[PDB]
Amino acid sequence: NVVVTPAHEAVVRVGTKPGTEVPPVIDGSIWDAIAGCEAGGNWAINTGNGYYGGVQFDQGTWEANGGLRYAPRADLATREEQIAVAEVTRLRQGWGAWPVCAARAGAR
């Protein structure tokens, strides 16, 4: 079948501690500079627009990459969690969803 199969699987078994161990991401600098751009550097920001603190992307996209395991909302998760969720998102699109903030942060 030419129909390509992506990783819909997401085991990552957490026990109780939300974010027991999240591997540091070197591009978290781009993620932090984006956060510093769009949020003014506020990962606990909740403007009330449906997009949560830090890199300021929506509940749906957050949930789509499965950020909820880190925290059902980015303003509950920390830098590295917004990084992880955005990591899936950036992985597919690049920084296309991240405007001039990504360019400023180091789009790649």
The first five atom37 places (N, CA, C, CB, O) and aatype in JSON, in Angstrom:
{
  "aatype": [2, 19, 19, 19, 16, 14, 0, 8, 6, 0, 19, 19, 1, 19, 7, 16, 11, 14, 7, 16, 6, 19, 14, 14, 19, 9, 3, 7, 15, 9, 17, 3, 0, 9, 0, 7, 4, 6, 0, 7, 7, 2, 17, 0, 9, 2, 16, 7, 2, 7, 18, 18, 7, 7, 19, 5, 13, 3, 5, 7, 16, 17, 6, 0, 2, 7, 7, 10, 1, 18, 0, 14, 1, 0, 3, 10, 0, 16, 1, 6, 6, 5, 9, 0, 19, 0, 6, 19, 16, 1, 10, 1, 5, 7, 17, 7, 0, 17, 14, 19, 4, 0, 0, 1, 0, 7, 0, 1],
  "atom_mask": [
    [1, 1, 1, 1, 1],
    [1, 1, 1, 1, 1],
    [1, 1, 1, 1, 1],
    [1, 1, 1, 1, 1],
    [1, 1, 1, 1, 1],
    [1, 1, 1, 1, 1],
    [1, 1, 1, 1, 1],
    [1, 1, 1, 1, 1],
    [1, 1, 1, 1, 1],
    [1, 1, 1, 1, 1],
    [1, 1, 1, 1, 1],
    [1, 1, 1, 1, 1],
    [1, 1, 1, 1, 1],
    [1, 1, 1, 1, 1],
    [1, 1, 1, 0, 1],
    [1, 1, 1, 1, 1],
    [1, 1, 1, 1, 1],
    [1, 1, 1, 1, 1],
    [1, 1, 1, 0, 1],
    [1, 1, 1, 1, 1],
    [1, 1, 1, 1, 1],
    [1, 1, 1, 1, 1],
    [1, 1, 1, 1, 1],
    [1, 1, 1, 1, 1],
    [1, 1, 1, 1, 1],
    [1, 1, 1, 1, 1],
    [1, 1, 1, 1, 1],
    [1, 1, 1, 0, 1],
    [1, 1, 1, 1, 1],
    [1, 1, 1, 1, 1],
    [1, 1, 1, 1, 1],
    [1, 1, 1, 1, 1],
    [1, 1, 1, 1, 1],
    [1, 1, 1, 1, 1],
    [1, 1, 1, 1, 1],
    [1, 1, 1, 0, 1],
    [1, 1, 1, 1, 1],
    [1, 1, 1, 1, 1],
    [1, 1, 1, 1, 1],
    [1, 1, 1, 0, 1],
    [1, 1, 1, 0, 1],
    [1, 1, 1, 1, 1],
    [1, 1, 1, 1, 1],
    [1, 1, 1, 1, 1],
    [1, 1, 1, 1, 1],
    [1, 1, 1, 1, 1],
    [1, 1, 1, 1, 1],
    [1, 1, 1, 0, 1],
    [1, 1, 1, 1, 1],
    [1, 1, 1, 0, 1],
    [1, 1, 1, 1, 1],
    [1, 1, 1, 1, 1],
    [1, 1, 1, 0, 1],
    [1, 1, 1, 0, 1],
    [1, 1, 1, 1, 1],
    [1, 1, 1, 1, 1],
    [1, 1, 1, 1, 1],
    [1, 1, 1, 1, 1],
    [1, 1, 1, 1, 1],
    [1, 1, 1, 0, 1],
    [1, 1, 1, 1, 1],
    [1, 1, 1, 1, 1],
    [1, 1, 1, 1, 1],
    [1, 1, 1, 1, 1],
    [1, 1, 1, 1, 1],
    [1, 1, 1, 0, 1],
    [1, 1, 1, 0, 1],
    [1, 1, 1, 1, 1],
    [1, 1, 1, 1, 1],
    [1, 1, 1, 1, 1],
    [1, 1, 1, 1, 1],
    [1, 1, 1, 1, 1],
    [1, 1, 1, 1, 1],
    [1, 1, 1, 1, 1],
    [1, 1, 1, 1, 1],
    [1, 1, 1, 1, 1],
    [1, 1, 1, 1, 1],
    [1, 1, 1, 1, 1],
    [1, 1, 1, 1, 1],
    [1, 1, 1, 1, 1],
    [1, 1, 1, 1, 1],
    [1, 1, 1, 1, 1],
    [1, 1, 1, 1, 1],
    [1, 1, 1, 1, 1],
    [1, 1, 1, 1, 1],
    [1, 1, 1, 1, 1],
    [1, 1, 1, 1, 1],
    [1, 1, 1, 1, 1],
    [1, 1, 1, 1, 1],
    [1, 1, 1, 1, 1],
    [1, 1, 1, 1, 1],
    [1, 1, 1, 1, 1],
    [1, 1, 1, 1, 1],
    [1, 1, 1, 0, 1],
    [1, 1, 1, 1, 1],
    [1, 1, 1, 0, 1],
    [1, 1, 1, 1, 1],
    [1, 1, 1, 1, 1],
    [1, 1, 1, 1, 1],
    [1, 1, 1, 1, 1],
    [1, 1, 1, 1, 1],
    [1, 1, 1, 1, 1],
    [1, 1, 1, 1, 1],
    [1, 1, 1, 1, 1],
    [1, 1, 1, 1, 1],
    [1, 1, 1, 0, 1],
    [1, 1, 1, 1, 1],
    [1, 1, 1, 1, 1]
  ],
  "atom_positions": [
    [[0.84, -1.21, 0.0], [0.0, 0.0, 0.0], [0.87, 1.25, 0.0], [-0.95, 0.01, 1.23], [1.7, 1.44, 0.89]],
    [[0.67, 2.09, -1.01], [1.4, 3.34, -1.13], [0.97, 4.33, -0.03], [1.19, 3.96, -2.52], [1.65, 5.32, 0.24]],
    [[-0.17, 4.04, 0.58], [-0.67, 4.82, 1.7], [0.31, 4.79, 2.86], [-2.05, 4.31, 2.14], [0.45, 3.77, 3.54]],
    [[0.99, 5.9, 3.09], [1.99, 5.98, 4.14], [1.35, 6.03, 5.51], [2.88, 7.19, 3.93], [0.33, 6.68, 5.72]],
    [[1.98, 5.34, 6.43], [1.49, 5.22, 7.79], [2.38, 5.98, 8.77], [1.39, 3.75, 8.19], [3.55, 5.61, 8.95]],
    [[1.85, 7.04, 9.4], [2.57, 7.82, 10.38], [2.41, 7.26, 11.78], [2.11, 9.25, 10.34], [1.58, 6.38, 12.03]],
    [[3.21, 7.78, 12.67], [3.18, 7.37, 14.07], [2.01, 8.0, 14.78], [4.48, 7.75, 14.77], [2.1, 9.09, 15.36]],
    [[0.9, 7.3, 14.72], [-0.28, 7.66, 15.48], [-0.13, 7.12, 16.88], [-1.56, 7.12, 14.81], [-0.89, 7.47, 17.78]],
    [[0.88, 6.26, 17.07], [1.11, 5.65, 18.36], [1.82, 6.62, 19.29], [1.92, 4.37, 18.21], [2.73, 7.34, 18.89]],
    [[1.39, 6.63, 20.54], [1.98, 7.48, 21.55], [1.91, 6.8, 22.9], [1.27, 8.84, 21.6], [1.07, 7.12, 23.74]],
    [[2.8, 5.85, 23.09], [2.86, 5.08, 24.31], [3.27, 5.96, 25.48], [3.83, 3.91, 24.17], [2.46, 6.28, 26.35]],
    [[4.56, 6.36, 25.49], [5.15, 7.21, 26.51], [4.42, 7.12, 27.85], [5.16, 8.64, 26.04], [3.64, 8.0, 28.22]],
    [[4.71, 6.05, 28.54], [4.03, 5.72, 29.75], [4.53, 6.53, 30.92], [4.16, 4.27, 30.04], [5.65, 6.34, 31.41]],
    [[3.69, 7.43, 31.34], [3.9, 8.19, 32.54], [3.15, 7.51, 33.66], [3.46, 9.66, 32.37], [2.17, 6.81, 33.43]],
    [[3.62, 7.72, 34.86], [3.09, 7.03, 36.0], [2.18, 7.91, 36.79], [0.0, 0.0, 0.0], [0.98, 7.65, 36.92]],
    [[2.76, 8.95, 37.33], [2.03, 9.91, 38.1], [2.64, 11.29, 37.94], [2.0, 9.5, 39.55], [1.94, 12.28, 37.72]],
    [[3.95, 11.34, 38.04], [4.71, 12.57, 37.91], [4.6, 13.08, 36.48], [6.18, 12.34, 38.3], [5.17, 12.49, 35.57]],
    [[3.86, 14.17, 36.29], [3.66, 14.75, 34.97], [4.91, 15.41, 34.46], [2.52, 15.75, 35.01], [5.32, 16.48, 34.92]],
    [[5.5, 14.74, 33.53], [6.79, 15.13, 33.01], [7.88, 14.6, 33.9], [0.0, 0.0, 0.0], [8.71, 15.36, 34.41]],
    [[7.89, 13.29, 34.07], [8.9, 12.62, 34.89], [10.29, 12.95, 34.37], [8.67, 11.1, 34.89], [11.16, 13.4, 35.12]],
    [[10.5, 12.73, 33.08], [11.74, 13.1, 32.42], [11.47, 13.52, 30.99], [12.73, 11.94, 32.46], [11.12, 12.7, 30.14]],
    [[11.64, 14.8, 30.73], [11.52, 15.34, 29.39], [12.9, 15.75, 28.89], [10.54, 16.54, 29.35], [13.49, 16.69, 29.42]],
    [[13.43, 15.05, 27.88], [14.75, 15.34, 27.31], [14.86, 16.79, 26.85], [15.03, 14.41, 26.15], [14.01, 17.28, 26.1]],
    [[15.92, 17.49, 27.3], [16.2, 18.86, 26.88], [16.32, 18.97, 25.37], [17.47, 19.35, 27.53], [16.87, 18.1, 24.7]],
    [[15.78, 20.05, 24.86], [15.78, 20.3, 23.43], [16.59, 21.55, 23.11], [14.34, 20.45, 22.91], [16.36, 22.62, 23.68]],
    [[17.55, 21.4, 22.21], [18.5, 22.46, 21.89], [17.81, 23.61, 21.16], [19.64, 21.91, 21.03], [18.29, 24.75, 21.18]],
    [[16.68, 23.31, 20.53], [15.95, 24.29, 19.77], [14.93, 24.95, 20.66], [15.28, 23.66, 18.55], [14.1, 25.74, 20.21]],
    [[15.01, 24.61, 21.93], [14.19, 25.24, 22.93], [14.53, 26.7, 23.05], [0.0, 0.0, 0.0], [13.82, 27.47, 23.7]],
    [[15.62, 27.08, 22.4], [16.03, 28.47, 22.33], [15.16, 29.21, 21.33], [17.51, 28.58, 21.96], [14.81, 30.37, 21.53]],
    [[14.84, 28.52, 20.25], [13.94, 29.05, 19.24], [12.55, 29.12, 19.84], [13.94, 28.18, 17.94], [11.77, 30.04, 19.58]],
    [[12.27, 28.13, 20.66], [10.98, 28.02, 21.32], [10.84, 29.1, 22.39], [10.82, 26.64, 21.94], [9.75, 29.64, 22.6]],
    [[11.94, 29.41, 23.06], [11.95, 30.43, 24.09], [11.93, 31.82, 23.46], [13.16, 30.27, 24.99], [11.29, 32.73, 23.99]],
    [[12.64, 31.98, 22.35], [12.66, 33.26, 21.67], [11.3, 33.55, 21.03], [13.77, 33.28, 20.61], [10.88, 34.7, 20.96]],
    [[10.63, 32.5, 20.56], [9.26, 32.64, 20.08], [8.34, 33.05, 21.23], [8.76, 31.32, 19.44], [7.54, 33.98, 21.1]],
    [[8.48, 32.36, 22.35], [7.71, 32.68, 23.54], [7.97, 34.11, 23.97], [8.06, 31.71, 24.68], [7.06, 34.83, 24.38]],
    [[9.23, 34.52, 23.85], [9.61, 35.88, 24.21], [9.07, 36.9, 23.23], [0.0, 0.0, 0.0], [9.01, 38.09, 23.54]],
    [[8.69, 36.43, 22.06], [8.18, 37.29, 21.01], [6.67, 37.43, 21.09], [8.58, 36.74, 19.65], [6.14, 38.54, 21.12]],
    [[5.97, 36.3, 21.13], [4.53, 36.29, 21.01], [3.89, 36.47, 22.37], [4.05, 34.99, 20.36], [2.82, 37.08, 22.48]],
    [[4.54, 35.95, 23.39], [4.0, 36.02, 24.73], [4.73, 37.05, 25.58], [4.07, 34.66, 25.39], [4.29, 37.39, 26.68]],
    [[5.84, 37.54, 25.06], [6.67, 38.45, 25.83], [7.5, 37.68, 26.81], [0.0, 0.0, 0.0], [8.08, 38.23, 27.75]],
    [[7.54, 36.38, 26.57], [8.21, 35.46, 27.45], [7.37, 35.15, 28.67], [0.0, 0.0, 0.0], [7.75, 35.46, 29.79]],
    [[6.21, 34.54, 28.44], [5.3, 34.24, 29.52], [4.59, 32.93, 29.23], [4.29, 35.38, 29.72], [3.59, 32.9, 28.51]],
    [[5.1, 31.86, 29.8], [4.59, 30.53, 29.54], [3.39, 30.24, 30.41], [5.68, 29.48, 29.76], [2.75, 29.19, 30.3]],
    [[3.1, 31.19, 31.28], [1.96, 31.09, 32.17], [0.88, 32.09, 31.76], [2.39, 31.34, 33.63], [-0.04, 32.37, 32.52]],
    [[1.02, 32.62, 30.55], [0.08, 33.59, 30.05], [-1.2, 32.89, 29.58], [0.7, 34.4, 28.92], [-1.15, 31.83, 28.96]],
    [[-2.31, 33.5, 29.88], [-3.6, 32.99, 29.47], [-4.47, 34.16, 29.05], [-4.28, 32.18, 30.59], [-5.36, 34.59, 29.77]],
    [[-4.18, 34.65, 27.85], [-4.88, 35.78, 27.28], [-6.37, 35.5, 27.18], [-4.31, 36.11, 25.91], [-7.19, 36.42, 27.24]],
    [[-6.71, 34.23, 27.03], [-8.09, 33.83, 26.96], [-8.54, 33.7, 25.53], [0.0, 0.0, 0.0], [-9.73, 33.78, 25.23]],
    [[-7.57, 33.49, 24.65], [-7.86, 33.4, 23.23], [-7.85, 31.95, 22.75], [-6.85, 34.23, 22.43], [-7.99, 31.68, 21.56]],
    [[-7.67, 31.03, 23.7], [-7.67, 29.62, 23.37], [-6.28, 29.11, 23.15], [0.0, 0.0, 0.0], [-6.06, 27.9, 23.01]],
    [[-5.32, 30.03, 23.12], [-3.93, 29.69, 22.9], [-3.21, 29.99, 24.19], [-3.33, 30.48, 21.7], [-3.39, 31.05, 24.78]],
    [[-2.4, 29.07, 24.63], [-1.89, 29.11, 25.98], [-0.45, 29.57, 26.07], [-2.03, 27.78, 26.61], [0.24, 29.71, 25.06]],
    [[-0.01, 29.8, 27.3], [1.26, 30.44, 27.58], [2.45, 29.88, 26.83], [0.0, 0.0, 0.0], [2.47, 28.73, 26.4]],
    [[3.46, 30.73, 26.68], [4.7, 30.32, 26.09], [4.75, 30.6, 24.61], [0.0, 0.0, 0.0], [4.88, 31.76, 24.19]],
    [[4.64, 29.56, 23.81], [4.7, 29.7, 22.36], [3.34, 30.06, 21.78], [5.2, 28.41, 21.72], [3.18, 30.26, 20.57]],
    [[2.36, 30.16, 22.68], [1.05, 30.76, 22.38], [0.3, 30.08, 21.25], [1.24, 32.2, 22.04], [-0.16, 30.75, 20.32]],
    [[0.16, 28.76, 21.3], [-0.66, 28.07, 20.32], [-1.86, 27.39, 20.97], [0.16, 27.05, 19.56], [-1.87, 27.14, 22.17]],
    [[-2.86, 27.11, 20.15], [-4.2, 26.8, 20.62], [-4.31, 25.44, 21.3], [-5.15, 26.85, 19.49], [-3.46, 24.56, 21.12]],
    [[-5.37, 25.31, 22.07], [-5.71, 24.09, 22.78], [-5.8, 22.9, 21.84], [-7.01, 24.27, 23.53], [-5.37, 21.8, 22.16]],
    [[-6.37, 23.15, 20.67], [-6.61, 22.09, 19.71], [-5.32, 21.54, 19.15], [0.0, 0.0, 0.0], [-5.12, 20.33, 19.1]],
    [[-4.45, 22.43, 18.71], [-3.15, 22.05, 18.2], [-2.29, 21.45, 19.31], [-2.45, 23.25, 17.57], [-1.58, 20.47, 19.09]],
    [[-2.37, 22.05, 20.49], [-1.68, 21.53, 21.66], [-2.12, 20.1, 21.91], [-1.96, 22.41, 22.89], [-1.3, 19.2, 22.1]],
    [[-3.42, 19.9, 21.9], [-4.02, 18.6, 22.12], [-3.68, 17.65, 20.97], [-5.53, 18.73, 22.28], [-3.51, 16.45, 21.17]],
    [[-3.6, 18.2, 19.76], [-3.34, 17.4, 18.56], [-1.97, 16.74, 18.61], [-3.45, 18.28, 17.31], [-1.82, 15.58, 18.24]],
    [[-0.98, 17.49, 19.07], [0.36, 16.96, 19.26], [0.43, 16.21, 20.59], [1.4, 18.09, 19.21], [1.43, 15.55, 20.89]],
    [[-0.64, 16.32, 21.37], [-0.75, 15.57, 22.61], [-0.04, 16.25, 23.76], [0.0, 0.0, 0.0], [0.72, 15.61, 24.49]],
    [[-0.28, 17.54, 23.93], [0.4, 18.3, 24.96], [-0.2, 18.08, 26.32], [0.0, 0.0, 0.0], [0.4, 18.4, 27.34]],
    [[-1.4, 17.54, 26.31], [-2.21, 17.39, 27.5], [-1.54, 16.49, 28.53], [-3.56, 16.84, 27.13], [-1.76, 16.64, 29.74]],
    [[-0.72, 15.56, 28.05], [0.01, 14.65, 28.92], [1.05, 15.41, 29.71], [0.66, 13.52, 28.1], [1.43, 15.03, 30.82]],
    [[1.52, 16.5, 29.11], [2.47, 17.38, 29.74], [1.71, 18.29, 30.66], [3.28, 18.17, 28.7], [2.17, 18.69, 31.73]],
    [[0.51, 18.61, 30.19], [-0.44, 19.48, 30.84], [-1.49, 19.85, 29.81], [0.25, 20.74, 31.44], [-1.15, 20.35, 28.74]],
    [[-2.77, 19.62, 30.11], [-3.87, 19.91, 29.19], [-3.89, 21.34, 28.67], [-5.17, 19.62, 29.87], [-4.7, 21.68, 27.81]],
    [[-3.01, 22.17, 29.19], [-2.87, 23.53, 28.72], [-1.41, 23.96, 28.87], [-3.81, 24.48, 29.48], [-0.75, 23.63, 29.86]],
    [[-0.92, 24.69, 27.88], [0.47, 25.12, 27.84], [0.86, 25.99, 29.03], [0.74, 25.88, 26.56], [2.03, 26.02, 29.41]],
    [[-0.09, 26.69, 29.61], [0.23, 27.58, 30.73], [0.37, 26.79, 32.02], [-0.83, 28.66, 30.88], [0.75, 27.34, 33.06]],
    [[0.06, 25.51, 31.95], [0.25, 24.62, 33.08], [1.57, 23.86, 32.91], [-0.94, 23.63, 33.22], [2.25, 23.54, 33.88]],
    [[1.9, 23.6, 31.66], [3.17, 23.0, 31.3], [4.27, 24.06, 31.3], [3.08, 22.31, 29.93], [3.98, 25.25, 31.3]],
    [[5.51, 23.62, 31.31], [6.63, 24.53, 31.36], [7.25, 24.7, 29.98], [7.68, 24.04, 32.36], [6.73, 24.19, 28.99]],
    [[8.37, 25.43, 29.92], [9.05, 25.7, 28.65], [9.27, 24.43, 27.85], [10.39, 26.39, 28.9], [8.9, 24.35, 26.68]],
    [[9.87, 23.46, 28.5], [10.26, 22.23, 27.85], [9.06, 21.42, 27.37], [11.11, 21.39, 28.79], [9.17, 20.66, 26.4]],
    [[7.92, 21.56, 28.03], [6.7, 20.93, 27.57], [6.15, 21.61, 26.33], [5.66, 20.93, 28.67], [5.78, 20.94, 25.37]],
    [[6.08, 22.94, 26.35], [5.66, 23.67, 25.16], [6.6, 23.35, 24.02], [5.63, 25.19, 25.42], [6.19, 23.28, 22.86]],
    [[7.85, 23.15, 24.38], [8.85, 22.7, 23.44], [8.45, 21.34, 22.88], [10.22, 22.64, 24.1], [8.48, 21.14, 21.66]],
    [[8.09, 20.39, 23.75], [7.8, 19.02, 23.3], [6.59, 18.97, 22.37], [7.56, 18.12, 24.51], [6.63, 18.3, 21.33]],
    [[5.54, 19.67, 22.74], [4.32, 19.7, 21.96], [4.55, 20.39, 20.62], [3.2, 20.4, 22.73], [4.17, 19.88, 19.57]],
    [[5.19, 21.55, 20.69], [5.58, 22.29, 19.5], [6.56, 21.47, 18.67], [6.2, 23.63, 19.89], [6.63, 21.62, 17.45]],
    [[7.31, 20.6, 19.34], [8.29, 19.74, 18.68], [7.61, 18.87, 17.64], [9.03, 18.87, 19.7], [8.13, 18.71, 16.53]],
    [[6.46, 18.3, 17.98], [5.71, 17.52, 17.02], [5.22, 18.43, 15.89], [4.52, 16.81, 17.69], [5.28, 18.06, 14.72]],
    [[4.74, 19.6, 16.26], [4.14, 20.52, 15.31], [5.18, 21.06, 14.33], [3.47, 21.67, 16.04], [4.96, 21.08, 13.12]],
    [[6.32, 21.48, 14.87], [7.4, 22.04, 14.06], [7.96, 20.96, 13.16], [8.51, 22.65, 14.94], [8.42, 21.21, 12.05]],
    [[7.9, 19.75, 13.67], [8.47, 18.6, 13.0], [7.81, 18.35, 11.64], [8.35, 17.36, 13.88], [8.43, 17.85, 10.71]],
    [[6.54, 18.71, 11.56], [5.75, 18.45, 10.38], [5.84, 19.62, 9.42], [4.29, 18.18, 10.75], [6.03, 19.45, 8.21]],
    [[5.7, 20.81, 9.97], [5.55, 22.02, 9.17], [6.82, 22.86, 9.11], [4.42, 22.85, 9.72], [7.05, 23.59, 8.15]],
    [[7.65, 22.76, 10.14], [8.83, 23.59, 10.24], [8.61, 24.63, 11.3], [0.0, 0.0, 0.0], [8.6, 24.33, 12.49]],
    [[8.43, 25.85, 10.86], [8.07, 26.93, 11.74], [7.03, 27.75, 11.0], [9.3, 27.79, 12.16], [6.81, 28.92, 11.29]],
    [[6.4, 27.09, 10.02], [5.37, 27.74, 9.22], [4.24, 28.31, 10.05], [0.0, 0.0, 0.0], [3.68, 29.35, 9.72]],
    [[3.9, 27.62, 11.14], [2.86, 28.09, 12.04], [3.39, 29.18, 12.95], [2.29, 26.93, 12.87], [2.63, 29.9, 13.59]],
    [[4.71, 29.29, 13.02], [5.34, 30.31, 13.84], [5.88, 31.43, 12.95], [6.46, 29.7, 14.68], [6.87, 31.25, 12.25]],
    [[5.21, 32.59, 12.99], [5.51, 33.73, 12.12], [6.89, 34.36, 12.33], [4.47, 34.78, 12.32], [7.88, 33.66, 12.53]],
    [[6.93, 35.69, 12.29], [8.16, 36.45, 12.43], [8.87, 36.1, 13.74], [7.86, 37.96, 12.38], [10.09, 36.24, 13.85]],
    [[8.1, 35.64, 14.72], [8.66, 35.2, 16.0], [9.64, 34.04, 15.8], [7.54, 34.79, 16.95], [10.67, 33.98, 16.47]],
    [[9.32, 33.13, 14.9], [10.2, 32.01, 14.62], [11.45, 32.48, 13.89], [9.48, 30.94, 13.79], [12.56, 32.02, 14.19]],
    [[11.27, 33.4, 12.95], [12.39, 33.96, 12.21], [13.36, 34.64, 13.17], [11.89, 34.96, 11.14], [14.57, 34.48, 13.07]],
    [[12.8, 35.41, 14.09], [13.58, 36.08, 15.13], [14.28, 35.06, 16.02], [12.68, 36.98, 15.97], [15.41, 35.28, 16.46]],
    [[13.6, 33.96, 16.28], [14.1, 32.93, 17.18], [15.15, 32.05, 16.51], [12.95, 32.09, 17.69], [15.96, 31.41, 17.18]],
    [[15.11, 32.0, 15.18], [16.03, 31.16, 14.44], [15.32, 30.05, 13.69], [0.0, 0.0, 0.0], [15.55, 28.86, 13.95]],
    [[14.45, 30.43, 12.76], [13.68, 29.48, 11.97], [14.59, 28.59, 11.14], [12.7, 30.22, 11.06], [15.6, 29.04, 10.6]],
    [[14.23, 27.32, 11.06], [15.09, 26.32, 10.44], [14.31, 25.03, 10.19], [16.31, 26.04, 11.32], [14.87, 24.06, 9.67]]
  ]
}
